[PDB]
Design a protein around this ligand. Structure first.
Ligand SMILES: O=[N+]([O-])c1ccc(OS(=O)(=O)O)cc1
Ligand SMILES: O=[N+]([O-])c1ccc(OS(=O)(=O)O)cc1
Lengths: 564, 564
C-alpha cells in the first residue's frame, strides 16, 4: 503493497488540503499527537496589495480537527502560511507553502458570461483593508425548475384533469458561495456538491441554499429545501436535519437562539383549509427546533396575521418580460407559489426572523404585509406597516410614527408621511435587532406607498433603522441611507443590512441591483457606510455569472471568531 | 392519474404504520390540522393475559410528528388502540384497529436456531406486570469480521511483508433490538437497516450498536462503529454524527449530560507512540462532544492511567475453544484489539461512563484495570480496585475499604478480604451513579481475586453497590446480590445494573450466561430484585438466535417518558 500517508511538513504533522472535501481553499495542519496551545495562523497576502489573513485558533478547534485549521487561501496558488504555537513551554513556528487547486462552477450553460462571478472593488477606505465578506449567491441550472409537490384536486377542476401542484418545490437553484476580500479576491469557496446536486433527482439535495447565519460557536446555520444544516469554515457539515414531517420548503432564514434552538421559516404540508382542501402553504410558518431536529414550537401565521389583507399584494410589480405591471389579483389564482391571498398562496412571504430574548418573542419581516412582533403566546405585539387594509383587532397593534421629540407624525393610510423623513418599509428584508438596541431593516422598496410609480426607474431602496417604544406603541426613524442613490441602488428583492459596532458602520448588501436590465449581469453591492457621517467606507460589486440572476445575502465574517 | 393518500380513520387523520420506516410496531395518527391537547394513548393487551400499554403524549411530540405517536403494538396483529384527547374544550375519543406486519431478521445462516430470539418468562410478581424492557442484543453476520484498519509497519517486520492491521474495525455485528413485555411478547422492534448494513461495504453502516441510553428528552443515544446517534421510539433518527476525524471505534457507551453534551468511548487513530509507531488505540479515550459533533473535551487514558499495569490482564480468561486458559501476556503481541499492555493494545477496555455533575468529573469502568474517577483537570481522583500492580502516584488514590462503622477492612493485594462480605469488582461493567447517591456496578467476576479458579464453574457475578467518601478516600459495600446464584448467573462479559427508585428494585441484565456452553443459545437474564428483601420481582430470560452469541445490555423503559 500500500501507500504511505503524507509525511510531516514541519514540526507538527502533514498539511492536508481540504480535509473535509467541501472547502478547497482550506487546509489542516495535522497535530500528529503534539500537545500545543497559543495557536495563531497567518495566511500572507498575494502580491504587493494582497490582504493578509490572520487568526487565533482555540482548543476546542484543535481538538475537533485534530489539527490547525488553515483558512483564507487563494485558489490555484502557492500560499505562504505561518503557524505559531507553544509546546513544552517553548515558542514555536513553522512556515508552509500550501498549494491549492482551482474553484469549479459545475452549473454552466450558454447563458454563462464566464465560470465565476466577477468582483469590482469600488472603494476601500483606510482601516478597512482587512474586511472579509461571505457572499451567499447562486447560479441557474441548465434545466431550471424541474419538480413540483403534488397537491389535491379542487372542487371545480376538470373531471379528466390530472391533480394540481402545490407548495414551492420549484424554488430550486445551484449555490455559489464564497468569501471575497477587499482586493476582490476569492479567499474561501464552499463546494457546490456540499449540499446541492442539480443533476440528480434526489430532493434531499435540492432547494435554495439561504439563511446563512452565524452561531455562538463561530459556525453557521443554513437551509436548503427540506433540510436544515450547520457547517463551519473548514467545510465540515456539523448538522444535517430533515425538516419535521409536517413541514416543507424551508427558505430565507435560520437563526440559532441563546437557548440552543434554531428558528426556521417553512411552509406546512397537508394544511387543511376551511373548505377542506389540502395544500402546502407558502412561506407562512415559523418553527423553533432543537439540535435533535425536534419541534419545540410552531407559529402558524395564517391564524395570527391576516392572509386576506391585499393592501400591499395588489400594489406589487410582476417582474419580481412583465415589469412596471402592477399586480392584478385574481380570485381563481391556483394554489401555489403565486401572489394571492389565503393559505396556499404567497400572501405573506416571510423572509427574516429575529429572536427577542428579553421577552421570548419573534420579529418577522413579511415581504407582503409588514414587520411584526409575535409573542411566545402566539399573539401579535406590534406591527410596523402602513395602516391600509388592517382590520380590527390587528389595527390596534399598528405602531404610531413619531419624531425625535415624540410628536406624532402625520401619515396617510398608504404610508406617505407629511413634512418628515419618516417612511415605512415596503417588501422589506432582514428585520433584525442591532447591538444598539434598535431595529434594522433593508427597505427594498417595491410597491412603495402601496402603488407602482409613474415610471419603473422611480424606485429606490434604503438602509433604515428604527427605535421602537413598545409601551407607548410608537416608532421612530432614527437613521437611513440610499434613498438618494436612486435606481442604481435599488434592490427589489433579497438583500440585507446589519449594524457593525466595531467600526461603527452599517454593513449592507444589495442583492438584485439591475435585475431587470435584460441581458446584463445582476449586481450585488457590498457596502459599509460610516454611521456618523454616511461616508462610504467600503463598496465592492459582485456581478452574476449569468444575466438577470439575483444574489441573496452576504455576511461580514471575522476569522478571529471562526475557530473558537 | 395519481393516487390519494390514506383517508382519515376517525375524527383526526389517517393512521400510518411505521411512518419513519425504522419501527414496524409503531404507528402515527395524523393530526390533519386539528388542534388538540391532553392526549392519551392506550394499546390493548392481546388475549386474556396481554399487557396493556398506556401513555400521555406531550405538545412537543404532537408538533414534531404532526400527529399522535402509537407505541407498543404487537407484530402481525390487529392491534386495538384507543386515543383520547381534548379539542375545542370537548373530550374526544377514537378506537382504531391498527394492523401490523412481521418482524424480520435479515441475518440468518446455518447456525440460526430460528429467526427471532426466544423469551421465557420465569417470574413476574404482582405489581410488575406493566414493566417494559428494551433489549440491546445482536446477531452474527454470515461472513463475520471482514474489515481491518490498515496500520503502520513496525520496526522488526519482514522486508517483503504487507502492512499490518491496527485498531478494532472487526468489532462488527448485526443488531437485534426490541422491547419485551412481562408476557414475553415483542412490543417494539428497531429495523436492523436503521443503522446497519452488513452485506454492503460502507463502513458508515458497520460496527456494534451499543451504549443505548435515555436522554432528558425521552429519546436515546447510541454508538455504532464510526458514528454516534440519537433516535426516538417512533424510529426517527434525530442525529447522526461522524466521529471527529482524530478518533475511531466508538463502543460500549454514550451518555448525554445535563449540559447538552455527550460522552463517548472511542480510540485515537494515528496515535503516535514514543517509539514513533502510529496505531489506532483501543477503548482508551473519552470524548465529550456537543450536538454539532464538535469536540468539547478529550480524556486520553494512556497519559492518565497506567497502560503497563498487567495485574488483572495476566489473570484473564482467553475464551472472552480456549477457556479456563489464564491469559499469557507476550511482549511481542502485535498491535490490535488484543489483551496486552501499552497504547495500541487492549490494556484498558473502558466500557462505561458516568458523569458527576456535582464536581464536573467522569467515572469510568475499565474492564482490565478497575473503576476510576477522573476530574475535568485530567487527574485521577480515586480508584476502586485491588492494590496489586499500581505504582505511585496512582496507588495513593486507591479507595480504602471500610465497614458500616467505618473501620478498615483488611484485604490483600489481590482484593481478597478477611472476615467480610466486601469484595472489589473484576472485569466489571456499568459503573453508574444511582438516584440514591451511590455507585452501582455489575461485577462480572472474571479474574476475580486476580486469578483463575480451580474449576471454570467456580465463577460468579454480582450486582453490587458502593458508598464512597471522597474526602476520607474510603469505600463501603452496602448491598450485593447474585454470588449465591452460581454459574447459571455468571456473565463473564457485558451486562448492566441500575437502581430503580420507583418500586425500589435493582434492575439487572446478565448478558452472557452460558456463553461457553458450546452449541447452546446464550442467555440474557432480565431481573428486578427487591432492594429491601432480595426477593425476585421479575425474571425473564432471552435466548440468543444462534449459539454462543452474547447479548449486550437492556434498559427498563417507561412509555410515560417517551413522548414529552
Ligand atoms: O426569484 N428569487 O431568487 C427570489 C425572489 C424573491 C425572494 O424573496 S426575498 O424575500 O428574498 O425578496 C428571494 C429570491
Ligand atoms: O465478544 N463480545 O461480543 C464482547 C466481548 C467483550 C465485550 O466487552 S464488555 O465490556 O462489554 O464485557 C463486549 C462484547
Amino acid at each position: 503493497a500500500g501507500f504511505k500517508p503524507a509525511p510531516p511538513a514541519g514540526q507538527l504533522g502533514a498539511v492536508i488540503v481540504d480535509p473535509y472535501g467541501n472547502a478547497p481553499l482550506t487546509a489542516l495542519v495535522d497535530l500528529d499527537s503534539h500537545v500545543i496551545s497559543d495557536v495563531k495562523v497567518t495566511v500572507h497576502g498575494k502580491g504587493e496589495k494582497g490582504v493578509e489573513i490572520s487568526y487565533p485558533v482555540g482548543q476546542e478547534s484543535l481538538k475537533t480537527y485534530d489539527g490547525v485549521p488553515i483558512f483564507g487561501l487563494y485558489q490555484k496558488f502557492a500560499n505562504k502560511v505561518t503557524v505559531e504555537w507553544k509546546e513544552n513551554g517553548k515558542v514555536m513556528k513553522d512556515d508552509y507553502v500550501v498549494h491549492t487547486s482551482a474553484i469549479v462552477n459545475n452549473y454552466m450553460d450558454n447563458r454563462s458570461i464566464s465560470d465565476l462571478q466577477q468582483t469590482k472593488v469600488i472603494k476601500v477606505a483606510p482601516g478597512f483593508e482587512d474586511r472579509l465578506y461571505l457572499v451567499n449567491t447562486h447560479t441557474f441550472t441548465a434545466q431550471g425548475s424541474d419538480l413540483h409537490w403534488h397537491g389535491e384536486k379542487d372542487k371545480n377542476a376538470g373531471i379528466l384533469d390530472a391533480g394540481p401542484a402545490t407548495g414551492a418545490l420549484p424554488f430550486d437553484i445551484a449555490p455559489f458561495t464564497f468569501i471575497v476580500d477587499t482586493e476582490g479576491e476569492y479567499r474561501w469557496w464552499l463546494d457546490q456538491d456540499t449540499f446541492y446536486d442539480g443533476r440528480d433527482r434526489d430532493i434531499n439535495k435540492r432547494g435554495y441554499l439561504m439563511g446563512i447565519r452565524e452561531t455562538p460557536r463561530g459556525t453557521f446555520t443554513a437551509v436548503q429545501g427540506q433540510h436544515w444544516y450547520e457547517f463551519d469554515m473548514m467545510g465540515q457539515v456539523l448538522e444535517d436535519h430533515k425538516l419535521p414531517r409536517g413541514f416543507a420548503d424551508a427558505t430565507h432564514e435560520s437563526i440559532e437562539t441563546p437557548n440552543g434552538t434554531v428558528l426556521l421559516r417553512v411552509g406546512k404540508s397537508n394544511y387543511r383549509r376551511d373548505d377542506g382542501v389540502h395544500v402546502t402553504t407558502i412561506r407562512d410558518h415559523i418553527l423553533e427546533v432543537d439540535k435533535s431536529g425536534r419541534v419545540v414550537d410552531v407559529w402558524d401565521l395564517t391564524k395570527i396575521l391576516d392572509p386576506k389583507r391585499d393592501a400591499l399584494l395588489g400594489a406589487l410589480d410582476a417582474g419580481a418580460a412583465h415589469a412596471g405591471q402592477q399586480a392584478k389579483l385574481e380570485p381563481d389564482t391556483p394554489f401555489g407559489d403565486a401572489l394571492g391571498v389565503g393559505p396556499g398562496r404567497n400572501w405573506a412571504h416571510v423572509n427574516s426572523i429575529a429572536y427577542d430574548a428579553k421577552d421570548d418573542s419573534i420579529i418577522l419581516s413579511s415581504r407582503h404585509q409588514g414587520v411584526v412582533k409575535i409573542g411566545r403566546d402566539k399573539q401579535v405585539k406590534w406591527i410596523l406597516a402602513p395602516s391600509k387594509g388592517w382590520e380590527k383587532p390587528l389595527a390596534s397593534k399598528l405602531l404610531k410614527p413619531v419624531d425625535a421629540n415624540g410628536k406624532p407624525i402625520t401619515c396617510n393610510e398608504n404610508g406617505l408621511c407629511e413634512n418628515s423623513d419618516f417612511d415605512f418599509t415596503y417588501t422589506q428584508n432582514t428585520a433584525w435587532i442591532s447591538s444598539k438596541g434598535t431595529l434594522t431593516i433593508f427597505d427594498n422598496g417595491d410597491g412603495r406607498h402601496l402603488e407602482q410609480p409613474a415610471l419603473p426607474t422611480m424606485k429606490y431602496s434604503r438602509f433604515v433603522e428604527y427605535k421602537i417604544d413598545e409601551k407607548k406603541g410608537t416608532v421612530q426613524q432614527v437613521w437611513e441611507y440610499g434613498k438618494e442613490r436612486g435606481y442604481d441602488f435599488y434592490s427589489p428583492i433579497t438583500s440585507i443590512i446589519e449594524y457593525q459596532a466595531d467600526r461603527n458602520t452599517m454593513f449592507g448588501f444589495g442583492g438584485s441591483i439591475h435585475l431587470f436590465d435584460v441581458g446584463q449581469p445582476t449586481v450585488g453591492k457590498l457596502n459599509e457606510i460610516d454611521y456618523k457621517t454616511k461616508e462610504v467606507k467600503v463598496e465592492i460589486d459582485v456581478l452574476s455569472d449569468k444575466p438577470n440572476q439575483t444574489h441573496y445575502r452576504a455576511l461580514l465574517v471575522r476569522p478571529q471568531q471562526m475557530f473558537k
